[PDB]
Amino acid sequence: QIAPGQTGNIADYNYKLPDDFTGCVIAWNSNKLDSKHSGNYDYWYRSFRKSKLKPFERDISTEIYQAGNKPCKGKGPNCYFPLESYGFRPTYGVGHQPYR
Amino acid sequence: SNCVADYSVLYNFAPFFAFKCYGVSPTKLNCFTNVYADSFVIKGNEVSQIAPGQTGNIADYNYKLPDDFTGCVIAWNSNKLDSKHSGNYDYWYRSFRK
Ligand SMILES: *[C@@H]1O[C@H](CO)[C@@H](O)[C@H](O)[C@H]1NC(C)=O
Numbered sequence: 001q002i003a004p005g006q007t008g009n010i011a012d013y014n015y016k017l018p019d020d021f022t023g024c025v026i027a028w029n030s031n032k033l034d035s036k037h038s039g040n041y042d043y044w045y046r047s048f049r050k051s052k053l054k055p056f057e058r059d060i061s062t063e064i065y066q067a068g069n070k071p072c073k074g075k076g077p078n079c080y081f082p083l084e085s086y087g088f089r090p091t092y093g094v095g096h097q098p099y100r
Numbered sequence: 101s102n103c104v105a106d107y108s109v110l111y112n113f114a115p116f117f118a119f120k121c122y123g124v125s126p127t128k129l130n131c132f133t134n135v136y137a138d139s140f141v142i143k144g145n146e147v148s149q150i151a152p153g154q155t156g157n158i159a160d161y162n163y164k165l166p167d168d169f170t171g172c173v174i175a176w177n178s179n180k181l182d183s184k185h186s187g188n189y190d191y192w193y194r195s196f197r198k
Contacts, residue, residue, distance in 0.1 A: 012124070048125050067125055068111035077115040084120075087148075089155070095167060096153040 002027070011053075013046040018055035027099050031090060034098035039087020043098070048082045105135065114176045118147055122171020138163070141178055141191045161197035 001008040004021040017023075034040055048065040061082070068078030075081060088098045107128045110116075121127060142150065142158060149156035150173060152165045159165075181191070 009122070009124070047121065067119065069108065076117050078111055080119060091155055093153050093167065 009047060010045065013049040013053060013059075016053045016055055016057070021055075029094075029097060030100040031088070031092075031097045034100070035088040035090045035092070037090065039089055040098075041085040041087055043088070044083040044085050046082050047084050048080055110174070116174050116176040118173070118175035120151070120171055120173045122152070122169070127172050140193050142175075144175075147175055157196070162193050162195075 001011045002015070002017065002025045004017050005019050006017075011017075017025075034043070046059065048067065049059065050065070053059065063082070064073070064075065064079050065082045066072055066079045070078070072079040105128070107126075119125075123130065140163065146156055146158035148154065149158045149160070150163070150165070151159075152167050152169045152171070
């Protein structure tokens with residue numbers, strides 16, 4: 001998904017490249033350094049947002065997002081935290097392993 | 101079945117505590133051939149084990165998602181049925197696998 005014109009939860013909500021993009025995307029497999037046996041929860045990604053991102057914008061808001069119809073406060077009545085942790089583990093497969 | 105699927109019923113039904121996804125959160129805009137819905141009841145300690153590629157005692161033997169499962173999964177409180185102090189059984193899946 002780290003490529004011009006792609007869609008998905010990262011291309012849409014965390015990081016987007018412009019369609020007219022010149023540059024290089026270099027991905028390294030980092031399991032040795034980022035994974036923990038209990039899970040590395042220092043890395044968070046945004047799963048909920050109201051709209052798609054524009055090129056090179058950085059949304060660092062932590063305001064609670066609601067997927068439902070009744071405007072709620074706090075967490076759990078259809079109000080969700082916009083970010084979710086991913087516990088990286090040495091035992092995950094190639095597609096679930098961390099990459100830098 | 102001349103069905104158009106609206107997921108406002110699901111947000112209205114109950115205050116779901118867990119709602120994970122791999123596609124998108126609205127999950128209504130999206131067509132697909134089948135929704136192949138599955139349901140079951142789990143202890144609220146292994147909820148994070150119902151995920152693509154996630155190892156654990158739950159799901160790895162009972163119900164697993166192999167990889168790139170459409171992520172959308174949801175979980176809400178079952179206390180209205182679970183009230184017996186000694187327990188019962190009706191909704192249980194295969195306990196574990198050899
Ligand atoms: C930038 O500010 C506008 C306010 O008009 C807002 O709609 C938009 O979401 C903001 N974007 C970011 C990345 O903060």
